[PDB]
Every structure is written in structure tokens, then in C-alpha cells.
Design an enzyme around this catalytic site. Structure first.
Site, PDB file in Angstrom:
ATOM      1  N   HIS A  52       0.882  -1.153   0.000  1.00 51.47           N
ATOM      2  CA  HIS A  52       0.000   0.000   0.000  1.00 51.47           C
ATOM      3  C   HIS A  52       0.924   1.207   0.000  1.00 51.47           C
ATOM      4  O   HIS A  52       2.047   1.137   0.498  1.00 51.47           O
ATOM      5  CB  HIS A  52      -0.872   0.041   1.259  1.00 51.47           C
ATOM      6  CG  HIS A  52      -1.998  -0.940   1.245  1.00 51.47           C
ATOM      7  ND1 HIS A  52      -2.186  -1.870   2.245  1.00 51.47           N
ATOM      8  CD2 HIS A  52      -2.994  -1.141   0.351  1.00 51.47           C
ATOM      9  CE1 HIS A  52      -3.250  -2.602   1.966  1.00 51.47           C
ATOM     10  NE2 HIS A  52      -3.758  -2.181   0.822  1.00 51.47           N
ATOM     11  N   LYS A  60      -4.090  -0.213  -8.165  1.00 48.88           N
ATOM     12  CA  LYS A  60      -5.223   0.698  -8.175  1.00 48.88           C
ATOM     13  C   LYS A  60      -4.883   1.955  -7.382  1.00 48.88           C
ATOM     14  O   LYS A  60      -4.004   1.948  -6.518  1.00 48.88           O
ATOM     15  CB  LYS A  60      -6.469   0.025  -7.588  1.00 48.88           C
ATOM     16  CG  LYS A  60      -6.364  -0.375  -6.118  1.00 48.88           C
ATOM     17  CD  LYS A  60      -7.588  -1.193  -5.691  1.00 48.88           C
ATOM     18  CE  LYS A  60      -7.508  -1.624  -4.227  1.00 48.88           C
ATOM     19  NZ  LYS A  60      -8.712  -2.401  -3.802  1.00 48.88           N
TER      20      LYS A  60
END
Length: 203
Positions: free
Chosen positions: A76, A106
Site C-alpha cells: 500500500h 489501483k
């Protein structure tokens, strides 16, 4: 399994990686800017881009190639919400790079996070990792490439003065990672720090 192999080749993989020359990533220029990402269903550098209205993200998945099965490893990237556009632009070259080891990722769409009343303190970017080999074993070459990639991302963000965000509660990261964090969805933060994948990425 993938993890079984990492454990039994832990030192071997580390020893090969630590002596490999720095990786080179040919960054992409012909990519969308952040506002472009909000296009809706287009193609860019082999990455299929998709922005549907059912979540707060814009997905990118390379129509290619990694031949292994998902072992749960992912990263992340956390930055101040206000600076997502800058962060995206700064990382676009690498994220859309033909040499990137990340086939699927994403980025949050800030318009959608506001429309869906979501909080955005971190994890504005998610990078999915998968073993490169058909037998689902990570190769020393691939792990080195992935580590090098993740570090280029870290350096790019700091060199751009991107203000860091808040690391997800379920993630772990070393003191030298200001934006990146790790977690394996298939398996306490204490336990994550012991994962062979994570340690080969940090030590």
C-alpha cells in the site's frame, strides 16, 4: 506452496538478490494524468484501466504477462489525501512502465471517496504482487526487481516532497519506508514482520 519455498530458500534468495546490479525501469511518458484517470475504460501501456462506480478506485491490470498463483503479497502507498494527484503523476512513469513487476494496482479516485463519504488517510495506492514462475515460486530475479521497484517509488515520492499519509492498521513497514507498507491478505502485525517475503524486501 509459495511461502514454503521462500522459507526453505530464505538465505539463498537473499544472497543472490544482494549481489545483483541495480534494476532499470524504462518509465512511461505516454500515460494519463490524474484527472484523466477519473479515462473510464481505456488502455494505457498494456494496462487496462477501469473506473466503475461501485468502489472508490481506478483499477489497472496489464493484459499480460508473472505466471504464478497469488500468494497474498501486496503493498500500500500512503500519502496526504490532498497530494494524491501529485503522487500519482510522480509515480505514473514507473506504474505504467513496461519493466514494472506489478501487473495489477489501483489508485483512489478522490471524487468518489467524497461521494461515498469514505475517509482517506492512507493506502491511496495498492500494488498486487504475484510469483513470476509457473510453479508459483518467486525467483531471486523477480524479488530483486520488486524490491528495487518499491524503493524507486519511495525515493520518487520523497524527492517530490510528497507528504506521507497514515499507514493502514493491518500493515507493517520498516523505519525507512515513509509511504510504502506491506500486508498479506491470506494470513497480528507481529506475525507479518516475520513473513519471509517482507524480510527479503526490507533487510
Amino acid at each position: 506452496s509459495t511461502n514454503k519455498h521462500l522459507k526453505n530458500n530464505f538465505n539463498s534468495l537473499h544472497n543472490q538478490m544482494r549481489k545483483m546490479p541495480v534494476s532499470h525501469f524504462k518509465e512511461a511518458l505516454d500515460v494519463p494524468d490524474y484527472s484523466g484517470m477519473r479515462g473510464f475504460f481505456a488502455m494505457s501501456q498494456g494496462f487496462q484501466l477501469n473506473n466503475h462506480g461501485y468502489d472508490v478506485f481506478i483499477h489497472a491490470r496489464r493484459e499480460s504477462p508473472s505466471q504464478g498463483k497469488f500468494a497474498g503479497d501486496k503493498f500500500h502507498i500512503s500519502v496526504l489525501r490532498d497530494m494524491v494527484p501529485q503522487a500519482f503523476q510522480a509515480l505514473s512513469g514507473l506504474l505504467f512502465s513496461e519493466d514494472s513487476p506489478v501487473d495489477k494496482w489501483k489508485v483512489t479516485d478522490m471524487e468518489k471517496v467524497v461521494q461515498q463519504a469514505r475517509v482517506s488517510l492512507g493506502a491511496q495506492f495498492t500494488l498486487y504482487i504475484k510469483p513470476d514462475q509457473e510453479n508459483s515460486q518467486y525467483s531471486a530475479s523477480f524479488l530483486h526487481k520488486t524490491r528495487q521497484f518499491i524503493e524507486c517509488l519511495e525515493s520518487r515520492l520523497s524527492e517530490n516532497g510528497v507528504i506521507s499519509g497514515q499507514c493502514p492498521e493491518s500493515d507493517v513497514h520498516p523505519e525507512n519506508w515513509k509511504y510504502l507498507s506491506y500486508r498479506n491478505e491470506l494470513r497480528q502485525r507481529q506475525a507479518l514482520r516475520e513473513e519471509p517475503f517482507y524480510r527479503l524486501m526490507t533487510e
